[PDB]
Amino acid sequence: TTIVALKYPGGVVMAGDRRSTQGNMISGRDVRKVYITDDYTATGIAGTAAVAVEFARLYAVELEHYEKLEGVPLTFAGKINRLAIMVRGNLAAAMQGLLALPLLAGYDIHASDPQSAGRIVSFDAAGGWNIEEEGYQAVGSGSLFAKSSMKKLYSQVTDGDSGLRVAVEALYDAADDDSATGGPDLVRGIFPTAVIIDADGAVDVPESRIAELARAIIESRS
Amino acid sequence: TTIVALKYPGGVVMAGDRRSTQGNMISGRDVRKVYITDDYTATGIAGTAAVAVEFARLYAVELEHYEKLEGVPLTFAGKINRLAIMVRGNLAAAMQGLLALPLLAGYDIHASDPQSAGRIVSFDAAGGWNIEEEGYQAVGSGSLFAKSSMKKLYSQVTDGDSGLRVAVEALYDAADDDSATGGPDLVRGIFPTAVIIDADGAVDVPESRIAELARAIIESRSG
Amino acid sequence: TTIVALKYPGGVVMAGDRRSTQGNMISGRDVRKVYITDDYTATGIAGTAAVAVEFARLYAVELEHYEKLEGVPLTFAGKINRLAIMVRGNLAAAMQGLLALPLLAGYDIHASDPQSAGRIVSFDAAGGWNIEEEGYQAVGSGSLFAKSSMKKLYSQVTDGDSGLRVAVEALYDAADDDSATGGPDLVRGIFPTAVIIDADGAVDVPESRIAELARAIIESRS
Amino acid sequence: TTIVALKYPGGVVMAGDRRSTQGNMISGRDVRKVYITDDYTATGIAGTAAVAVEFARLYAVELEHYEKLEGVPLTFAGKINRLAIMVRGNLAAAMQGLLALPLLAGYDIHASDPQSAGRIVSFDAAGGWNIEEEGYQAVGSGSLFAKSSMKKLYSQVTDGDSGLRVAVEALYDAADDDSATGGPDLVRGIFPTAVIIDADGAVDVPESRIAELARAIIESRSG
Amino acid sequence: MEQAMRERSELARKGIARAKSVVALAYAGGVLFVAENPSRSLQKISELYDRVGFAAAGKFNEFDNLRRGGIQFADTRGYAYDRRDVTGRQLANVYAQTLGTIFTEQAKPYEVELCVAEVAHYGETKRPELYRITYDGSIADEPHFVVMGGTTEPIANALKESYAENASLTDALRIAVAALRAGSALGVASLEVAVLDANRPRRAFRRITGSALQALLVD
Amino acid sequence: MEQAMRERSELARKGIARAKSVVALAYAGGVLFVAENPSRSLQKISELYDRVGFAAAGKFNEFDNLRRGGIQFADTRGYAYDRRDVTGRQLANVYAQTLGTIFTEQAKPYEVELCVAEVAHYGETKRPELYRITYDGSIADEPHFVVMGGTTEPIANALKESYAENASLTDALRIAVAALRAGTLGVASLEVAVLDANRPRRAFRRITGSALQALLV
Amino acid sequence: MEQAMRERSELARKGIARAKSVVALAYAGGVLFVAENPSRSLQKISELYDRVGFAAAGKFNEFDNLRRGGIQFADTRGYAYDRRDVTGRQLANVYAQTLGTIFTEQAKPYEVELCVAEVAHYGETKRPELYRITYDGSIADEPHFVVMGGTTEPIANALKESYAENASLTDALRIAVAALRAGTLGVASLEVAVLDANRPRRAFRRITGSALQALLVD
Amino acid sequence: MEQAMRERSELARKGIARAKSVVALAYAGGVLFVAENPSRSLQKISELYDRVGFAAAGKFNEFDNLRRGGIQFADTRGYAYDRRDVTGRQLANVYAQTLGTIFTEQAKPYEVELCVAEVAHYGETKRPELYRITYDGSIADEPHFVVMGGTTEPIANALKESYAENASLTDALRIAVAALRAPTLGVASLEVAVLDANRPRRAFRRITGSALQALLV
């Protein structure tokens, strides 16, 4: 599994692969690991599938719950804190093999500079959190390959599109060196999923664009 | 044990073997592992017999309970979620040997088109779930053999009867390579159980049909 | 221990040996392991003596309790379910050595065909249950010898008397190959206990008849 | 420890030795292990001394408690059930070394035949129970030897006196082969304790009677 | 309290008087229960234990609660000790205690009247026992018959003269229905009839229904 | 004591007399439930178990509480034992016990009247059972029909002189709506359901919209 | 018994009669909620679930308690099963049960009146549903409009004469504010929200300030 | 029922009328709290959270209980979520809920009246918010000023005629003390505090002693 997130001028992007494994066996090819949790926030999760999906769903439900009760969404720090508390709450089961790490990407509408409103927060198994100032972050079994790739490719990010291509390429390198992360399946037409968030909100990146970007990467590597 | 489920145009089919074992010893030949949980859903379960049957029973009771209380049956997603929560609830006992994995096959009446309105959901021991978009799925000690058989035979599925054939044949291959899965007992006349579900609901396939199909498979592999 | 039960045309029979052991030492010769739990049901139990007897007593009391409270006895499926729940309830103590497996034989008065209204249900330690649609079943340390004997002798079962013979003979083979199962003690005149159930209810077979069958079997083997 | 009980025509007899040990060390010479729990029942207990005495005392209190509350004594089956429930209740502590097994001898006033109204019931550590028809029974570290002696000597039991002698002799053999069982101490004048129960109730056998029978046995074995 | 307890006693007594009547009388074969009951399936007479039966008059849900509680008590005592230790005197005693506590402490007193009957065990010579428990826990030991519910005076008088403790089942039944008729103004459709049959091996309680009861009625 | 119970009983009786009426009568195909119900989505008649149905009159939230309690009881009993051990006599009995306790101990008694009906199992031959439980836990076993809520006397009388055993579905329905009139009654003001003894498992079945309009004319 | 219940019912009825009025009516685009509310941050209309909205009249802390309880019920159910299993009928039913319990057992009955409204899911053609729950748990399902709080009769009649099915948003708004007057408003005295059947997921949306002024000019 | 609630409302109302008066009004620098207080250590105005202040009139132990409960609520929210999620609307709402429960269910209702005020965070342009919570849980959203305790009418009218939306601290204080009069109150009978929108984090600060004396002259 690999989830990537990077900031571009005025927005943020998050992408994730589609592969589910049980040990060495492939048990999933169309899996979705990146979710839109609220109008301006998206979460990608790595680890035990059951716990991961429960995290994403329950987290979105919690945010919208606070929004409807108090008439205003949580501050971004509040969202961070609740996700962290959820992870810390799962620590016990994580020690027993039901581990799940989230990666949070958002656009803070209360931020000072509408271009520096992008937010990327990483977590550890104890619910430690980090707001990333260096522009990108990844989680999962291929996160070190994806981060080391983005370390070289990030200078190419100049708008909401170059960022998507650097994300997809980082996922490509992750799948290139990590068998638990799935790369582009041109035979079946299955590509990573992506969500992009700017001042207009959080939207799903259409599949066709990720397909064309992936093909560009592949033919570039041939 | 092997439970198979596959989608056919306008419906779904689920079949299961009949063998009950304790270690190497065979302790059952007529066991049933596929149950009609509601008018449009059937569940096949693998693992510890007690836990499996209790899962099927309690699950059916839960669905009908919600239906009678709220005057409408659960959405299919709701049914999936409840089964998953049940498995997740059993995880602790599963760690001590009372493991039970279900496989869910249903017909979603709220689907946008009675073509591909069939649904197949598989689970793991932590109650992870997956809605299969590739047409078939299996669970149990022979699930890999059955899934690999259906990987080759699925292109032949065009209606309910061809799907039922491919299901029974996948069970035949599973029993061919896995001693914990039982094949057709032509001496006793005991064959896998099957349920087929379409817009008219979920019905039990009569033993006759499954027998004819089994002998068709045997004679195809013989002469 | 060996408990056998087989169906005959229009009824069911259940028989059990009389031996109580502690390891290798024989601690009982007149023990009874088959009980009439209901007007139309009999239960034989194998394992720890205390747990077995308490199972039989508590189960009979439970059935009669429901009968007097609701004015009608439980359906046979209900009886199966209650016995199963009892075993599953004991699983914890069974893991520590207080193990007890029951075998249930009954006559379903609500069945469509009175000739096939006999019922035989076997259980496992987790309360799993099986309604036998094959004619016979056994439980205990000698149950495999008894099942393999009945596999050959079952074709001879045509009435209650032939069924009782086949049952006692299966117990004879079990005791022949299992030292924990007791055979007929011709010196003391102690023979297996038997219960037969038809439309007239469940009655205990008198010891004289079982002794006659035992001597027939012995002479047949010499 | 050895407790014996045997049936004689119209009654029952129970006897026990007097030795208390801690490992190899003798910590008691006059210990009493057989108790009259009610007018028609007596219990002799083997194992941990504390638990044994607590069993006898608590049991007598329970029986008399029921008698005063309901105005009638328990049926013999009821008494057996209560003693068994007590043992099963102690199972947990028994697993940790506080084991005590009882042996019950009684006279059933509600029995059909007064000559065979004697009752001897043995128990196991889970409170399993058996009503003995063999005629005799023993419990304790020497129970094998005493039961094997009574197996040979039981045909000589024709009344209460011959039964008493056979009991004391079984205790003598038990002490002969088991160092945890104490034999007659002719220097100190300490002999086994015995209780005899008939239609007139349960009475303690006097020390002069048991002493005479003991000296007869000793002289018979000494020539 | 001088008037609260008076009001409670009156509520219960009136409740019992406004309800149909029940009779239980000892006959040569054991004990006979006859109750005016139009229902096809709602019972006023029940088995308690092997040789112990139960009859009630008053509000259904309340004496049914008491019936279920009595069955619970009996089965529990038989399990804890032995079946032979469960006696009619015991059930009568626990019913007296229970109805006393209900009468003093429940939100509303129970409009019920109870009869606990016991016949001898198989093969034992012993006269039947009848116990009467009232809404306030009062307990009485009746020797021949018990009448509960409605206007009891005509039924008690009818029974008191022309009674046979050694009557036949049919004779005792027809005397019982006669006494029930003296408190009117019946047949199979208006009666619930059951018997504690001292000649049965274990469970003495059995119901007399339909054509068989018609046989006992019409001759 | 006397006046508290008097007042509770009167509150309940007035509450029931102020609510719409419901009738349930046995016919050749099982049991028929007809209730004055203007609502599109609120129900006075419901399924309890495979062969057991439920009808109620009075305050909605209260008899709905009782309905859910009955479904819970039935499902639990079927799980603990078997689906065949669940009977209409049981649900009626528990409703009597419950309504007795509510009437005696709850802050305000329930202004409800209940009917529990049972038809035979598929293939089994058994006369239907109708049960009526009132606000104080009183229970009665009716052989032909049950009327609850509002002014019953004219409806009960109408049924007494117009009901026949083993009527057709259309006949039984017309008789039911006729008896309801005595105290427009088209499809828009009716809620109709049936326990159909001819169904294999779940006998409860609603008759709504075009089908009901067809059955009325 | 009867006197305590008379007093509870009377207290609740008077308390509701003293509070401002709320109207909810079905129009071509969904359901419209209009309530007399001079405050600028305290709410009488709120979102319950994706396609389910909530309106209340009476004592604020009480119907706000009920509002939060309804949100809790809806979110908990949607989590336990699925978002499509949460319905307006369910919420109305649970509000009836809860208000029954409050009216019968709490120290003081709730002086509140509730409306639960549901529109169809995106792309589905389903008629809107209006539910009215009263201080004692009585529930009724109206097909066109619901009026709560204050003197309701003049508003109910005003709507009865002036209401038309499938009206435009502006039309329904004008008719609603008109019916409210008979019992001069504008943006500073109104709280207006709508269940917008044309929105993909969350149908609830508020109409405030400049937009509301635009719809009021018409 | 009705009698009991009337008596409760009267007890609380009389209690509030007999108590000292408090005023809270928005000025150019934030929010101003002025209260008649002869004590030296018993405080009627207090800090709740970063930008949220609290003022009360009535029985001391009771509104002090509410003050502590509000502090607990605010701190708990800020910890569970974030300090920026604690708002004046929330504290006012929870105070309305709490006083509702107290008014209906406590042995004696609380003879208190509450004001929750909030100013903007440092560097933000948000007009102050004033909330008024009364003894029965009624909550109101005031735009300019709130007066509590004693006979309020003359003070409320005085502020209605003399209020200036953007007055200076000295000006607003003079107006508040003026309206409070309508013995000769001064820097010994007054407790004054301010929510100063120009503080970086904690906006609540007291104006006492020499500084306050400077403000009056």
Ligand SMILES: COC[C@H](NC(=O)[C@H](CC(=O)N1CCCCC1)NC(=O)CCc1ccccc1)C(=O)NCc1cccc2ccccc12
């Ligand atoms: C690193 O670990 C690999 C992990 N794989 C798993 O967790 C796989 C996934 C799988 O076989 N299925 C998905 C659910 C339906 C059946 C098929 N189960 C397991 O590993 C079983 C866990 C377990 C074993 C024993 C006792 C308790 C628990 C994975 O793919 N994690 C990636 C992932 C992230 C977010 C959402 C997801 C949703 C579905 C699948 C994967 C998802």
Ligand SMILES: COC[C@H](NC(=O)[C@H](CC(=O)N1CCCCC1)NC(=O)CCc1ccccc1)C(=O)NCc1cccc2ccccc12
């Ligand atoms: C591969 O997994 C082995 C499993 N075996 C078992 O479950 C067998 C079944 C069995 O002996 N009997 C069936 C019911 C009673 C009569 C005989 N019990 C066992 O293995 C004992 C479990 C145990 C656990 C912890 C402590 C002690 C013991 C099996 O065959 N499972 C297959 C299966 C799936 C769904 C429904 C079923 C229903 C009946 C029988 C089997 C069923």
Ligand SMILES: COC[C@H](NC(=O)[C@H](CC(=O)N1CCCCC1)NC(=O)CCc1ccccc1)C(=O)NCc1cccc2ccccc12
């Ligand atoms: C487990 O297979 C061996 C078992 N043996 C036992 O259960 C024997 C029986 C025995 O020694 N006595 C019977 C009662 C009176 C004294 C003599 N106890 C034991 O083995 C001791 C159990 C235990 C010890 C310590 C901690 C926990 C548990 C047996 O024979 N089971 C067969 C059996 C089946 C149904 C009813 C029975 C009733 C009485 C005796 C046996 C019965």
Ligand SMILES: COC[C@H](NC(=O)[C@H](CC(=O)N1CCCCC1)NC(=O)CCc1ccccc1)C(=O)NCc1cccc2ccccc12
């Ligand atoms: C286990 O078989 C040996 C047993 N010995 C014991 O029970 C002796 C008794 C003993 O030393 N004394 C009696 C009391 C006054 C001092 C002397 N305790 C012990 O051996 C130690 C107990 C223990 C060990 C570890 C943890 C907890 C506890 C015995 O003799 N049992 C025979 C016996 C049966 C009925 C009633 C009795 C009463 C007194 C003494 C013995 C009795």
